[PDB]
Amino acid sequence: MQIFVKTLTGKTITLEVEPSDTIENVKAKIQDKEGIPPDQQRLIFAGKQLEDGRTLSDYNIQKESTLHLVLRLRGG
Amino acid sequence: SRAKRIMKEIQAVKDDPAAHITLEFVSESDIHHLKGTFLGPPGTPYEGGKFVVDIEVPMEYPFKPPKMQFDTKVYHPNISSVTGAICLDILKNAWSPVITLKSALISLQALLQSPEPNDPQDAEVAQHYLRDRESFNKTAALWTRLYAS
Using a CB-CB distance cutoff of 8 angstroms, which residues of chain A are in contact with residue B92? Answer: 76
Rounded-to-integer distance, Cα A46 and Cα A42, Å:
13
Which technique was used to obtain these atomic coordinates? NMR
What is the CATH code of the structural domain delimited by A1-76? 3.10.20.90
Residues 6+ apart with CB under 8 A from B15: none
Quickly count: other Cβ atoms within 10 Å of residue B71's Cβ. Answer: 13
Residues 6+ apart with CB under 8 A from B97: A10, B62, B63
Closest alpha carbon to B11 in B81, B143, B100 = B100
Using a CB-CB distance cutoff of 8 angstroms, which residues of chain B are in contact with residue A74? Answer: 118-119
Inter-chain touch B87–A42, beta carbons under 8 Å: no
User: In CATH, what class is B1-149?
Assistant: alpha beta
Kindly name the residue from B87, B108, B111, B112 that is annotated as catalytic: B87
Is B21 a known active-site residue? no
Rounded-to-integer distance, Cα A54 and Cα B58, Å:
41
In angstroms, the separation between the Cα of residue A18 and the nearest Cα of chain B is 24
A57: which DSSP letter? G
Inter-chain touch B116–A44, beta carbons under 8 Å: no
What is the rounded end-to-end Cα distance, in angstroms, of chain A? 36
Rounded-to-integer distance, Cα B115 and Cα B22, Å:
24
Rounded-to-integer distance, Cα A50 and Cα A26, Å:
10
- For chain A, the structural domain boundaries read 1-76
